[model samples]
Target: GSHMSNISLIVGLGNPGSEYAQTRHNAGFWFVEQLADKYGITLKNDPKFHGISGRGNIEGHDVRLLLPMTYMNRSGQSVVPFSKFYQIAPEAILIAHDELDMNPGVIRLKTGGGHGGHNGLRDIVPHIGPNFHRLRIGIGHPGSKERVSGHVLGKAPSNEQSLMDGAIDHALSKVKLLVQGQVPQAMNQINAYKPA
Candidate 1:
C-alpha cells in the first residue's frame, strides 16, 4: 500500500483533461500513462499534489509515479510536494517531459541536467535543483514563433504522428530498463533505437 519508498519517483508533466490529452505538450504524460498501463498501476486522484498518482514496480525495481496537475509552466508545484512526501531525493527522481529541440520520433534518456527553456523544467529546477534524470521527448519546432504554442499543444500532423507514437513506446521500454538498474544500457538502447 505504501509502495516502495526507496524507489524512484517519476513525474510526468502535462496539462490536464482530454482537451490536452493528445497534444505534443503531453508527451510526458502519454509516456507515463503507457508505463502505468504496462505495469498495471493505478493513477488515482490525489488532491494534495493536484494530480493523479500511482505506486508500483517494473522489472523488479520499485517505482512511484506522478503526473502534476498544474499548468505546464508550473509543473514543479505538484512534484515538489510529492517528492517531499515520498522523501525522494532529486537524484533519485526521473522527470519524463517534452523537448522542443529534438524532432519527432526521437526519445532520449539523460541524467541530471538543465531545463533547456522548458517552462515545466524551469519551474522544477528551483525545487529539485536539477540533479534529476530526464526522459526528454521531442516535439520538434513548428518552424515559427506564432505557431509554436498551438503546435506543441496540438497533435502531430497526420503524416508525422507516427514519430511521436513510436517515441512513446520507445520511452516506455526505456523506463523499464532504467528501473532495472540498467540506466546506461537503457540510454544506449533508446539512443540507438529508431522506430520506423
Candidate 2:
C-alpha cells in the first residue's frame, strides 16, 4: 500500500447532521462527496475514527478521504486521531473548507496559513500544525461581521448554489493533477474557474 504522492490524506471540514447539510459550512462535505462518487469510495461512519472515512486510488495514488464528524469547532478531534493512526504528516494532509475571503463560485488551494477565523482550522492547527495544504472553497461573506454567523449557517440562494456547484465541478476537474502532485498544473486550472 505504497502510494508516494505529496498528499495522501484529504479532510473535508464541516459540521455534522441534517441542519448543516446545506449551509455554507458544508461546502467541504460537498467536495468530498464529489470525489467519493468519482472514485467509488463510500464514506461510511467509523466510530473509532470519529467520522466517516473512505479510501481509494486516484491518479494511481492511494488516497484517504475523511469527513470529520465532530462539529466544526472540534474538527481536530477527528482529524488528529485519524492522521496519527496512519502516520500522515501535516504537509501530506489537504483540508478542504469554506472560505470567506474569496467570492462565491471561487476556490483556491494553498499550503500553510493561519486559520483566518475558521473554527475548524483553528482547532486542527494545534494538533496537526499549520503546514498542511488547504483547499479553500469560497462561499462569499455577508460584508459585515454582525452578519457572519447567519451567513455561514444560512442556505444559499439558488443562484449562489449554482455558482458553488460550478466551482466544485471545476475543482473536481483538476483533481487528477492534484493527486498526481502536479500542484502548479492544478492551480492554473483551478484559479481559472470563476463565475461565468
Candidate 3:
C-alpha cells in the first residue's frame, strides 16, 4: 500500500475559542485557514467531529481540511474519530502545529517523531501512533520557562505576526507538492523561502 502518496486528511491543531484565537498556539488554525481560503473553501463547524472541516480538490486529489475544536491538549479527541470515520490511516494524515524551538520565520516538515512536549502532539500520538506527518510552524520561544505560558497564549508582536503570515504563505505555495507526497522536495522549497 502506497500510504505515502495518499494524503487524505490534513489537520491543523489548535485550541477552540475566541480568547485563544490569535494566540501563538493557534498558528495551526491560521495555517488551516490559509489552506481552505486558497481553494475558496470555508471550514464550517462540525459538531459531530468537535471541530471544523472542509473538503476540496488539490492537484486532482480529494483532501479533507480539519481543525480540531478540542483545546490544544485534547486535540486528538477530534482527530482520531474523524480519521477513523474517513478511514484515513495515521500515515496518510498530516498535522500542523506550532514549534517553540524554531524562529518565527522558519517552517519545517517531517514525519514520525516524538511530540516534543507539545500537548497537541502529546495527546495525539497515543491514539494515532507516531507515524504521521507534522508541519512545524515556528513561533519562537519566550526565552524563559516561566514566561512560556504567557508567550504561547498571548498574541505575537506585530513584527513576528508578519513573519508567521509569511511562513503560512510559503507553506500554502507548496501545498501541491506536499499533498503529492513530495514532502522532501516541498521542505527544500519552503525552507529556502525568504521575505522580499
Candidate 4:
C-alpha cells in the first residue's frame, strides 16, 4: 500500500451526544460534519477513545475525521492517542474549534498559540503538545468576561447560523488544501477570500 505524502488527523473539538448537539460550544462538531458530508463519510461511534470517527480519502489522500466524545473540557486524552498512533505531527493535525474572541464566521488559522480561554484547546495542548494546528472558527464573545460560559453554551442567533454554515464550508476547502501539502497556498487563499 502506498502511504500518503501528507496525511493529517483533523479533529473537531466538541462534546458528544444529542443534548449538546446544538449548543454553541459544539460548533466544531458541526463544521466537521460538513466536511464528512462533502467526502461522503459517516462518523461511527468508537468507544475506545470516547469519540466517533470516520476514515476516507480526501483529494486523493487518506484522511481521518474525528469528533471527540469527551466532555468539551476534557478532549485532550481522546485526541492524543489517535494522533500518536498515526504519528501525525501537531502541525499536520488540524483542530476545528470555536473562539469567543472573534465574531461568528470570522476565520483564523494559527500554529501553536495560547489556548485563549478555550478549554477544549487547553486540554489538547498538554496531551498533543502545544504545536498543533488550529483553525479557530470565531463564535463571538461575551458582553463582559463575566458572561463567558453562557455565551459559549448558548446557541448562535438564528441568522448567524446561516452565515457560519457558509464559513464552515469555505473553511473546509482550506482544511483540504492544507492537508494536501499546500499549506502556504491554502493560507493565502483562506486569508484572502472574503465571502460577501
Candidate 5:
C-alpha cells in the first residue's frame, strides 16, 4: 500500500455560467458546491485563480475548494496557478470530475490515472502530471459515441439525478477519511456505496 499525502485542495472541474450548471458535465461542480455548503465555506469569484474559490478546515485539515471557471477543457488554466500560489503539491490535491464509463449512483476514488478522454483531466495532466487524486463521479455513458456531447451537456432525468445526488451524499459521508489521507479506508466505504 502507498501512503498518500493529506488533501490540501479539492478542485471541481466544470464550465461556468448558469447554462451549464445543471448539466451532467457539471457533476464536479455539484460535489464542490455541496461540500462547501456542508463546511460553511462561501466560494467567491477569484480573478487571481480564474475561478470561484474558498478556504476552510475539514476534518482538522486546512483545505481549499475551487471550481474552475475556465470551462471543462481548460481546467488547468485555473488549477495550476492557484495550487502553485498556495504551494500545494499535486499529490495533495483531489479533483472531482464526472466519469463516463461508470453508471449513475457509482463513484470511485483513485490516484494518478490517465485522463480516459476526460477533457478536464486531459487538460490538467500536461500542466501538473497525473499524480493528483481523483473523485470520479459517474454520469453514465450515452451508448453511442456521437451522442456523448449532447448527453453530457444535457440535463439528467429526475430519477437519474436523484441517484447521482445519492452517490455524492455517500461520498460526502467519507470526506473526513479522505481529507486525512486515509485513502484505502475511504475507498472501502465510498466505492461500496450504491444509491437505492
Candidate 6:
C-alpha cells in the first residue's frame, strides 16, 4: 500500500544561536518549537544526536522531533546519525525548512524533490537520497539573487512576521493529517491557505 506508513521523525533545519532565532531562515526552528509547546514535548540538547530532540506522540502515532544544532550547511551531520540510530527510513521523515520562492504566510508540503538551493536541504539530500517529505515554510525572496542571503538571514518586518506566524499555525493545525500519512489531503488544505 502506498500509504502504508506514517511519519516517524520530523526534523527542523536551522542555524544554532540566539542571533538566528527570529530570522526568516529559522522558520523551521519556529515550527518545531511550536510543535513541542503544543504537544508538551520537551526538546533538549543531545550531543549524540547533534541536535535538540524529543520523542512524543502525535495523532496517536509515536513520533520524534529534532532541531539540528549544526549550522545550516551541516544539517545532515545531525539528521543522518539520529535517523540511523533509530533505524527510521528516509521516507518516514519530514524536513521543515524555509522556502524562498513563496511569499510570507504561504507554505507547501511535498516529497522527494531537489533541494532548491536550500543549504540545509542540499546537505541532507545526499545522505538521505531525497526520499523524505518537506514542509516548506515560506519567507519570500529578497527580489534579487544577490540579496537572498540578507533576506533569509534577516528578520522579517512585523506585518510579514504576523503573516508567517499565521501560516505556521495553519500548518500546525494540519499535523494530524500529516502524521497519518494523508499527504495529499494535508496539501490541499495547506496550499489553499492565505493569511489575512
Candidate 6 lDDT = 0.89
User: Compared with the true structure, what per-residue lDDT tens digits does model 2 show for residues 49-94?
Assistant: 8999999888788889999998999889899989999888886788
lDDT of each: 0.81, 0.87, 0.86, 0.78, 0.90, 0.89
lDDT per residue for candidate 1 within 120-145, as digits (tens), equals 89998888698787888888888887
User: What is the alpha-carbon lDDT for the whole of candidate 5?
Assistant: 0.90
Local error of candidate 6 at 20, Å? 0.6
The parts of candidate 3 lying over 4 Å away from their true place are 1-3
Off by over 4 Å in 2: 1-5
Error of 2 at 119 (Å): 0.6
* Candidate 1 wrong stretches, greater than 4 Å: 1-7
Model 3 lDDT per residue over 1-196, tens place: 1256567788998888889999999998999888898877668989998999998888877889999988998898899899888888887888989999889988888789899878899988998799887889999998888888888898999999999899888888888887788877976888786655
Per-residue accuracy of model 4 over 6-106 as CA lDDT, tens digit each: 53677899877787888778888988888899888778988887789888888878788889988988898788887777677777788888888877767
Cα lDDT for residue 173, model 2?
Answer: 81
For candidate 4, the 10 contiguous residues with the lowest summed lDDT are 1-10
All candidates in order of lDDT, best leading? 5, 6, 2, 3, 1, 4
Clash count list over all predictions: 0, 0, 0, 0, 0, 0
Give TM-scores for every candidate, taking all chains together and pairing residue i with residue i: 0.92, 0.95, 0.94, 0.92, 0.96, 0.96
**In the order shown, what is each candidate's alpha-carbon RMSD?**
2.6, 1.5, 1.7, 2.2, 2.4, 2.0
Please write out the lDDT profile of model 5 over residues 1-196, one tens digit for every residue. Answer: 1135788898998889999999999999999999999988889989888899999888788889999989999899999989888888899898999999998899999889899889999989898899998999999999898899998999999988999999999888888988898888988888898886
The better candidate by lDDT, 1 or 3, is 3
